[PDB]
Symmetry: D2
Subunit: 33 residues, 4 copies
C-alpha cells in the first residue's frame, strides 16, 4: 500500500463526517506527531 492511495481514501471518508467525527479524528492526528 502507498501513502498517496491511503490519503485519498481517508479524504473520501472524512468528507462525509459530522463535526463530532472530524474533531475526534483531528485529536487522533495530533497524537501521532
Amino acid at each position: 500500500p502507498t501513502e498517496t492511495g491511503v490519503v485519498q481514501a481517508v479524504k473520501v471518508l472524512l468528507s462525509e463526517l459530522s463535526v463530532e467525527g472530524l474533531d475526534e479524528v483531528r485529536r487522533f492526528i495530533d497524537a501521532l506527531q
Copy 2:
C-alpha cells in the same frame, strides 16, 4: 457517512493491496 462514499474509499484502498490481502478481504465479505 453514505454507502457510496464508503464503497468508493474501500475501492481506493483495495487497489493498493496484494493478492493475499484481497483474498482476506473477500473471505470477510463472505462472513457478512
Copy 3:
C-alpha cells in the same frame, strides 16, 4: 502503510455496508 493495517481498516468499513455495497466491493476485487 502496511497491508495488515489497511486490511483491518477495510474490514471495519465493510462491517457497516449493506448487501448491495458488499456486492459492489466483491465485484471490484474480481477486477483486481
Copy 4:
C-alpha cells in the same frame, strides 16, 4: 454506515502514515469545517 465505524477505520489508516501524509489530511479536515 455509522460515523463511529468510519472514525475507527480512519484511525487505523492514519496511525501508519508519515508526517507528510498526516499533514495533508489535517489540511483537508480544516477545509471541512
